[PDB]
């Protein structure tokens, strides 16, 4: 290279950005984008720890990113744990705010 000297110690980093990360609502798949264009296929992990277990999907953009969507069951602050090669990323777990409220209801009229 020409007077490069651009081999810093920590360069490969991953950050999440999206609506599902900032906040969300019950019974709604929180969709967000994960910056993995630099990280590159490695040992990325995905987990959510909140007031309820919410499944997490994984998509292959085969371009330079990773799409994920989690469907919560209860309102509250969800913790999206995202580790990369046994190393927590700078921003995770991402505390996502989820709103929502349930209530009981009747059915029949005259039995």
Curated annotation (Swiss-Prot):
Post-translational modification note: Ubiquitinated by FBXL22, leading to proteasomal degradation.
UniProt Filamin repeat ranges: 8-98
Membrane-crossing segments per the record: none
UniProt subcellular location: Cytoplasm; Membrane; Cytoplasm, Cytoskeleton; Cytoplasm, Myofibril, Sarcomere, Z line
Tissue-level expression: Highly expressed in striated muscles. Weakly expressed in thyroid, fetal brain, fetal lung, retina, spinal cord and bone marrow. Not expressed in testis, pancreas, adrenal gland, placenta, liver and kidney.
Superkingdom to which the source organism belongs: Eukaryota
Protein family: Belongs to the filamin family.
Its biological purpose: Muscle-specific filamin, which plays a central role in sarcomere assembly and organization. Critical for normal myogenesis, it probably functions as a large actin-cross-linking protein with structural functions at the Z lines in muscle cells. May be involved in reorganizing the actin cytoskeleton in response to signaling events.
Subunit structure: Homodimer; the filamin repeat 24 and the second hinge domain are important for dimer formation. Interacts with FLNB, INPPL1, ITGB1A, KCND2, MYOT, MYOZ1 and MYOZ3. Interacts with sarcoglycans SGCD and SGCG. Interacts (via filament repeats 17-18, 20-21 and 24) with USP25 (isoform USP25m only). Interacts with FBLIM1. Interacts with XIRP1; this interaction is mediated by filamin 20 repeat. Interacts with KY. Interacts with IGFN1. Interacts with MICALL2. Interacts with ANK3. Interacts with SYNPO2.
Disease tied to this entry: Myopathy, myofibrillar, 5: A form of myofibrillar myopathy, a group of chronic neuromuscular disorders characterized at ultrastructural level by disintegration of the sarcomeric Z disk and myofibrils, and replacement of the normal myofibrillar markings by small dense granules, or larger hyaline masses, or amorphous material. MFM5 is characterized by onset in adulthood, clinical features of a limb-girdle myopathy, and focal myofibrillar destruction. Myopathy, distal, 4: A slowly progressive muscular disorder characterized by distal muscle weakness and atrophy affecting the upper and lower limbs. Onset occurs around the third to fourth decades of life, and patients remain ambulatory even after long disease duration. Muscle biopsy shows non-specific changes with no evidence of rods, necrosis, or inflammation.
Additional information: Silenced in MKN28 and MKN74 gastric cancer cell lines due to aberrant methylation of the gene.
Name of the featured protein: Filamin-C
Organism: Homo sapiens
Phylogenetic lineage: Eukaryota, Metazoa, Chordata, Craniata, Vertebrata
Gene this chain is encoded by: FLNC
Covered residues, full protein: 1856 to 1953 of 2725
